[PDB]
Symmetry: C3
Subunit: 347 residues, 3 copies
């Protein structure tokens, strides 16, 4: 929300939140203060009757460390584009990969869920990504109401230096080669929706040499998801099968993985919204004797009280079901439970 400018066919929208947030947990890398804020701009310019231009930026600013700390802010979203009426839209920048057009349905927990769990950011086209060109088509050319598809290309984001470098190099866990993805979602009835997504990306030489886990030239995801949203009820599931594309913590990638998320929610009139959910990630054919391993397994219960559109409070209880083993220690995967209390101002 918050339209600070609307004049002569040009609109500016300032949005964000301040999220006062504390975590309680035996895991000392998670426990403690997690206050952060988000600020962003959504901009729109009418060019002619059939053509609109637009841009969007969204910045994350941590407030949970000191004034002398490092790396406390980063860009989540930054892209510019054109909207061609009902012929579709094109944008390029740092944007969401299309896979999340489906997995976003289960990313609605009070605090946990979403990226950092069954997938992450800078993780091929699973979440937010550098350098994605994205074509989107609404209502299949104004013909089939409720049918949306998207086509997406990402250029190589490679190593810092050496043969595989690009200008914007990173470490192997956040690299990608050339890749594409596609999504498709259909509102079969009102309230009910189904959706599929596919993605294919080249892997980099660093991904196939530096970490011990995960080998192959290609990274692939296959995703299907369901969603009921009506009569104050929200049900959603997402099943995703991945090849060489899901992080096995810090140790590398899983050659194969199966990811499952499901969530149920009710919205009471006076503003309470309880939530239960289950999330797992099963990793297959890991090297170095790891074999089959749980990457992620937890039940999630919590609630959000909405005071109004600008202010809410919430608790979330992550009931961790992973067994502590040599895989979870060496990969740095948390096996402890976590409670989260938060108070959020939004604009």
């Amino acid at each position: 929300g918050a339209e600070i400018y609307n004049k002569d066919g040009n609109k500016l929208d300032l949005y964000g939140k301040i999220d006062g947030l504390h975590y309680f947990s035996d895991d000392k890398s998670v426990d403690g203060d997690q206050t952060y804020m988000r600020v962003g701009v959504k901009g729109e310019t009418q060019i002619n009757d059939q053509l609109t231009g637009y841009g969007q930026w969204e910045y994350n600013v941590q407030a949970n460390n000191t004034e002398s700390s490092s790396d406390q802010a980063w860009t989540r979203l930054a892209f510019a584009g054109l909207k061609f009426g009902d012929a579709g839209s094109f944008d390029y920048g740092r944007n969401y990969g299309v896979v999340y057009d489906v997995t976003s349905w289960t990313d609605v927990l009070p605090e946990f869920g979403g990226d950092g769990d069954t997938y992450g950011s800078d993780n091929f086209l699973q979440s937010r990504a550098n350098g994605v060109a994205t074509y989107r088509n609404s209502d299949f050319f104004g013909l089939v109401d409720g049918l949306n598809f998207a086509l997406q290309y990402q250029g190589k984001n490679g190593s810092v230096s050496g043969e595989g470098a690009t200008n914007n190099g990173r470490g192997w866990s956040k690299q990608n080669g050339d890749g594409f993805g596609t999504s498709l979602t259909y509102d079969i009835w009102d309230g009910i929706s189904a959706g599929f997504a596919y993605s294919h990306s080249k892997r980099t030489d660093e991904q196939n040499s530096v970490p011990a886990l995960g080998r192959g030239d290609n990274a692939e995801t296959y995703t299907g998801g369901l969603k009921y949203d009506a009569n104050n009820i929200y049900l959603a599931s997402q099943y995703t099968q991945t090849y060489n594309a899901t992080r096995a913590g810090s140790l590398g990638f899983a050659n194969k993985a199966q990811n499952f998320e499901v969530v149920a929610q009710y919205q009471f009139d006076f503003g309470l919204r309880p939530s239960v959910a289950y999330l797992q990630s099963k990793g297959k054919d890991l090297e170095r004797g790891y074999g089959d391993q749980d990457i992620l397994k937890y039940v999630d219960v919590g609630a959000t009280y909405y005071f109004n559109k600008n202010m809410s409070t919430y608790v979330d209880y992550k009931i961790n079901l992973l067994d502590d083993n040599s895989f979870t220690r060496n990969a740095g995967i948390s096996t402890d439970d976590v409670v989260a209390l938060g108070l959020v101002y939004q604009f």
Copy 2:
């Protein structure tokens, strides 16, 4: 000021300044360009007759170094809260420790004074801190005009790793354990005020193990202060005794210390505002031979010319009274004088 949004019970206030600032000094770590700017957002949302929600962000941006320099921006404030009419208010985030509800009375110098002097930021509840829950009450439930109090809790903010760690780990000088604080201020007249504040925090293991100076399980501060502010006159003083809480420069903490600050100012009608002040911090029972030492001692003379509410210029002259000794050299405490010239745009 600068209300950029006020619609349907939601308001948004964009504030900040651009401070064009040069320091002249023999201290090479202080001398030279000091230009920086502040930006932030105050947001308020009416929820119902008795309840208002709010949040506030404030960001510091250095402009005195290069475009390839590191760590030039940080968050000063990020918190969200609720205001329950005259039953009080609550907020959590990065915010001011309640001790500063009193010591703020002497932090009105043209440029110097405030944090970095007798206390600093991320210094228990003496100034800005991570993860403070703060209950505030003004006019003692509407019954006693001018009587204000505050109760405050702060969660542990620990080491980067090891036993004593939290998510948001920092070095020993900005760590704190669990702690609390309280403040109380009374307006006897509409100009004259007195105030007290207390805080008690647990020290962390790194604070007792890494630096040479300061031993103890607990940090304590006791603060009393007086203020005259009317008829264009401003007089203020503040006396604070601390235990394991005041920084002995880079060498650790002072087992006990006494801090005194006092300041007088006069506001002429044409906009000039002269200022004289005196500031000291006397440390006691320091280890390694140091015994009693001055941590800070200086006289300050300066003035601010206010063109209007949005634009001012100022000079400030810190006449440093410290002797250059083994302590001040080893602790990295400046003993040189400083002149500051500034031009400030504010919105």
Copy 3:
């Protein structure tokens, strides 16, 4: 720029852009995604009939790396000032060195050109700089614009030459000044001259292999034609111990030439051709004379409207790959850029 506040003589102007930008090149340190955005505020407060106060901030934010990458934002401009009616103005902060009052005339390519090419940021008074005090005057107490500028020392991180805001030798400067003069001879036709003199630092005369001297100097002259849908401009600049010989140091003397031609069609297309070179002279370590920068530039920008544009730019590199270009890390490969830009 979007006026988000205007009340009781105080105006606030929010401006910026989002630049969806890809580079293609065999140079792996240039090739790839280059998406970034810029955001800024221009503030103006009426004080009295003969006095206005103002400030401006402009921030760069890279969006082409990960959420765990570091050093992805920096301040380009931050300054506060007073304007004394038409009798000119003063401002202090991080701002453009006055040399750019003239070289700005060739900095109009679709994408390339400007800082990074014949000169850089934090490069004495040639571009953006820390700690510049700038007095400016319109109509020389007519149509003749004059500026005088002083910069305090920005020196080493530690040691003899330190200041608070220390940096590496490539971006250091000592005490310096500059002046500029520009005039509109005919309508459309402008000429301009600029001089800067700056003390160098001990690190600049001891750490790099290239560039020795107590002072840095720039003489600049430039011409501009800007009427009838036509834009022509050139810039010739001579420098002593002021132009960067890549990573190796400074060039004892250099000669920099920049020229550009452009045409603006009514339906919004704006083709562009330009030529840029930097010739370094009297270099140490056997280098002698060397090309620092040499390329032809062709491209175009389509403007949908005042808020949205697309562009292509093609840098045709003419440098010969030799020992100087490799050791100094100067790119000799070509570059194509495609971008889409939203501006507010």
